């Protein structure tokens, strides 16, 4: 076994020394430099550059970077059951046995959802055993896809860290027990989504490069529709699509843009798997500003938003103007929802900062169906903030 640990020191000489120095603090302070790699991004930029773990996040991202896998590895790390929506214990860490209810409650549960995984991890290429630190009653054995950085390093022991960015689907799920007790084991593949985060500059060069020539595609009456809906019109189309206005106060003018926009989203779908960012205001989860319940300092009101939204669909009747980026904007400042979609290759939707006017915005269609797969919180200075992971459904 001892080559091991001498191939892990093999690839540490692979490395920058700014690299090393970064592992060197990774190896001291693991529990928060992981912390801040899930929800670094979230923030403005100028706070980002400002975190004194910016630097070091940027060193050992690209570390990991320096070993990348000539083909798929199967990988095994224990996670929490409330990773993937199951806000509660599959068993008590006193126990032994996991009940065959609760085997299908937890498969129940992750059924038929991807769930994005981010930030840095330590991964095992072997299953646990008696010895190994075994926290939690659920063991995920991912497959780690072609050229997934994978970086062995020392610490007596040796580990294995990789940094996740993508969505998870859980395959199969089966009972194993190690040293008298009772884990699921749940097998796993990776679901690739393009993802820019906080790199706001490289999305829009996604952006432009595929929608600069959108607004030559379309029929006069569509561009017109679309250039009025981007000065200020949306605020019209949307209150009247809100407010059920076709129904309850029709406006067939009001009809026609919205038919005219709908055909301008269908004209050049997004082109792949592609994931998006909205600062949600309370009313769109059917809250309002002075909402109690809107208070997310409160664990009681993230439990009950939880239950009310992890697994169902949320709806919008009108338009849902979306970011290509995960930071913070001066102009959403204050939400405290962060809904961030998964749009399926092949759906209706536009970069819209590719026309000359205004930022980063892709707009998708009105009418439009978003499953919750799971809800995760993080602080914002004393605020907490809800990230939502939500999959665009047809």
């Known amino acids: 076994k001892e080559w091991e640990r001498k191939e892990a020191e093999r690839i ?5 020394r700014s690299e090393k120095e970064a592992l060197e603090s990774y190896k001291k302070d693991s529990v928060e430099i992981s912390k801040y790699s899930q929800t670094r991004n979230y923030f403005y930029d100028y706070q980002i550059e400002a ?3 910016e630097k070091e996040y940027k060193e050992l991202r690209n570390a990991i970077s320096k070993n990348k896998i000539d083909k798929p590895m199967y990988v095994y790390y224990f996670e929490s059951p409330e990773k993937f929506a199951f806000n509660k214990v599959i068993r008590t860490e006193n126990q032994n046995e996991i009940s065959l209810e609760k085997f299908n409650e937890f498969k129940e549960t992750i059924q038929n959802k991807l769930f994005k995984q981010d930030g840095f991890k330590d991964i095992s290429l072997y299953e646990p055993g008696k010895g190994d630190e075994k926290p939690t009653p659920l063991l995920m054995h991912l497959k780690l896809p072609r050229n997934t950085g994978m970086l062995p390093y020392t610490n007596n022991n040796v580990s294995t860290l990789i940094e996740q960015g993508y969505s998870i689907k859980i395959d199969k799920i089966v009972r194993i027990v190690i040293d008298g007790k009772h884990y699921i084991k ?51 189309i949307n209150n009247y699509l809100i407010s059920n206005g076709p129904v309850n106060n029709p406006n067939p003018e009001l009809d026609s843009k919205i038919t005219n926009i709908e055909n301008a989203l269908k004209r050049e779908p ?12 309370p009313q769109e989860f059917g809250l309002t500003l002075t909402s109690p319940e809107y208070d997310f300092n409160k664990l009681e009101n993230i439990d009950a938003f939880k239950s009310k939204w992890e697994g169902q669909a949320l709806s919008y009747p009108n338009f849902i103007s979306t970011s290509i980026g995960s930071v913070n904007m001066s102009a ?41 797969n799971k809800i995760d919180s993080y602080k914002d200075g004393t605020i907490t903030k809800l990230i939502v992971d939500a999959t665009l459904i047809p």
């Open 12 to 16: 540490e000489q692979k490395l920058e």
């Open 51 to 53: 975190n004194s773990r």
């Open 186 to 236: 749940a097998e796993a593949s990776v679901v690739s989504s393009l993802d820019f985060k906080d790199d706001v500059s490289k999305g829009d060069s996604w952006g432009k490069a595929n929608y600069n020539d959108w607004s030559n595609k379309l029929t006069p009456n569509e561009l017109a529709d679309v250039n009025d809906y981007m000065r200020g019109g949306y605020t019209a």
């Open 270 to 281: 997004i082109p792949t798997n592609l994931t998006v960012y909205r600062r949600s205001g």
């Open 332 to 372: 959403f400042a204050k939400r405290k929802i962060v809904l961030r979609i998964t749009i399926p290759k092949g759906s209706p939707g536009a970069y819209l900062s590719a026309i000359p006017g205004y930022e980063y915005e892709v707009l998708l269609n009105h009418g439009s169906k978003f499953k919750i």
